[PDB]
Ligand binder design. Sequence first.
Ligand SMILES: O=C1CC[C@H](N2C(=O)c3ccccc3C2=O)C(=O)N1
Ligand SMILES: [Zn+2]
Length: 111
Amino acid sequence: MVLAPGASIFRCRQCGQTISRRDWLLPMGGDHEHVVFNPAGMIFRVWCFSLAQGLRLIGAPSGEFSWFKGYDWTIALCGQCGSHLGWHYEGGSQPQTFFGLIKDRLAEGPA
Ligand SMILES: O=C1CC[C@H](N2C(=O)c3ccccc3C2=O)C(=O)N1
Ligand SMILES: [Zn+2]
């Protein structure tokens, strides 16, 4: 508990949409940060969150190339501007669901 925290809320870097909160960071496999690459070779510093808002989840889930064993993913866009912010994971265990958001696509700031 601190007065006037500046590192409280994550917003979409491109538009400001409210997306998540530092309090909702989730240490999957012991770390909230997972460094991964996709089939196109892009490297992502993914932060895992229990909860997020302000996104639009696109399509139906897929297990293909999943970075997290037992989870299927859907692309998560900023619901306001369409920026690709990460993925929603579902279908797994403990937790059943979570979000993996691309750290450098978010801005962190006060509540
Ligand atoms: O857990 C995941 C999320 C989806 C992510 N992914 C991508 O970022 C991607 C880009 C191009 C073609 C196919 C994929 C893909 O499966 C990926 O590689 N693993
Ligand atoms: Zn946005």
